[PDB]
């Protein structure tokens, strides 16, 4: 059972833009999504500390950086929160409506991409050097899911059938074919050094 669902207008032209601007620091969009990964850890974090019982789903509170070379990906995971259909399919998407808004009237003379994460849209970046990006979620208590957009106005929701995942988010970059740099150790040791270097949890970097 696969859904589809168009973007918002504001989002679609966010994305194509991020496609289709000249823009050489690419590098940023790691920066992004782990931290997005570190939101999530403190979320949950925060909530067991009144509901001991949420760790149920899990007690390790990481994250894990993982390339394939052979299927082209990078993967960022985390058990954090995680998310539901609904933040999947509405909640976040009517947030980013207006991030849009800001960030896009800030690019018009002055402010670079950069900057995006000022405006709680960084996840957006990994379109920088993803052709196609996946998103596989779970949150106490729905199912477990998988959204999937390359871009070009719509995005799909399934329920997830692979392997379970106790509870969290991976983001899997499916790269352009010529950003495979970022599935480099060095490179990856590189950006998260320089730009996530002091994250509140262990980020391991897996090898391959
Ligand atoms: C309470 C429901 N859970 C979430 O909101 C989560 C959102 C994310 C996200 C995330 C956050 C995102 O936006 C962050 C900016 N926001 C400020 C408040 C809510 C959205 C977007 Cl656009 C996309 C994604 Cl996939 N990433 C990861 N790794 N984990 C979680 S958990």
Same mark, same amino acid.
């Given at each position: 059972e696969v859904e589809t669902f168009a973007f918002q207008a504001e989002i679609a032209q966010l994305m194509s833009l991020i496609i289709n601007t000249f823009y050489?620091?690419?590098?940023i969009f790691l920066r992004e999504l782990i931290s997005n990964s570190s939101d999530a850890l403190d979320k949950i974090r925060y909530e067991s500390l009144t509901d001991p019982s949420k760790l149920d789903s899990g007690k390790e509170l990481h994250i894990n950086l993982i390339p394939n070379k052979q299927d082209r990906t990078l993967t960022i995971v985390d058990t954090g929160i995680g998310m539901t259909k609904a933040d999947l399919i509405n909640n976040l998407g009517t947030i980013a409506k207006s991030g849009t808004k800001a960030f896009m009237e800030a690019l018009q @003379?002055? @402010?670079? +991409?950069?900057? +995006?994460?000022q405006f709680g849209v960084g996840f957006y970046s990994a379109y920088l050097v993803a052709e196609k990006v996946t998103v596989i979620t779970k949150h106490n208590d729905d199912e477990q899911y998988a959204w999937e957009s390359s871009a070009g106005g719509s995005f799909t929701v399934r329920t997830d059938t692979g392997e379970p995942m106790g509870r969290g988010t991976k983001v899997i970059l499916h790269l352009k074919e010529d950003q495979t740099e970022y599935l480099e150790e060095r490179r990856i040791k590189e950006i998260v050094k320089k730009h996530?270097?002091? +994250?509140g949890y262990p980020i391991t970097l897996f090898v391959e």
């Amino acid at each position: 059972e696969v859904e589809t669902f168009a973007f918002q207008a504001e989002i679609a032209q966010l994305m194509s833009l991020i496609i289709n601007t000249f823009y050489s620091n690419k590098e940023i969009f790691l920066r992004e999504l782990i931290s997005n990964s570190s939101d999530a850890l403190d979320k949950i974090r925060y909530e067991s500390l009144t509901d001991p019982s949420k760790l149920d789903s899990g007690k390790e509170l990481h994250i894990n950086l993982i390339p394939n070379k052979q299927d082209r990906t990078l993967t960022i995971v985390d058990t954090g929160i995680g998310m539901t259909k609904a933040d999947l399919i509405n909640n976040l998407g009517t947030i980013a409506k207006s991030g849009t808004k800001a960030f896009m009237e800030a690019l018009q @003379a002055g @402010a670079d +991409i950069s900057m +995006i994460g000022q405006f709680g849209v960084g996840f957006y970046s990994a379109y920088l050097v993803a052709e196609k990006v996946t998103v596989i979620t779970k949150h106490n208590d729905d199912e477990q899911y998988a959204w999937e957009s390359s871009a070009g106005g719509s995005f799909t929701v399934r329920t997830d059938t692979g392997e379970p995942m106790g509870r969290g988010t991976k983001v899997i970059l499916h790269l352009k074919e010529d950003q495979t740099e970022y599935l480099e150790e060095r490179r990856i040791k590189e950006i998260v050094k320089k730009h996530s270097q002091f +994250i509140g949890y262990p980020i391991t970097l897996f090898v391959e």
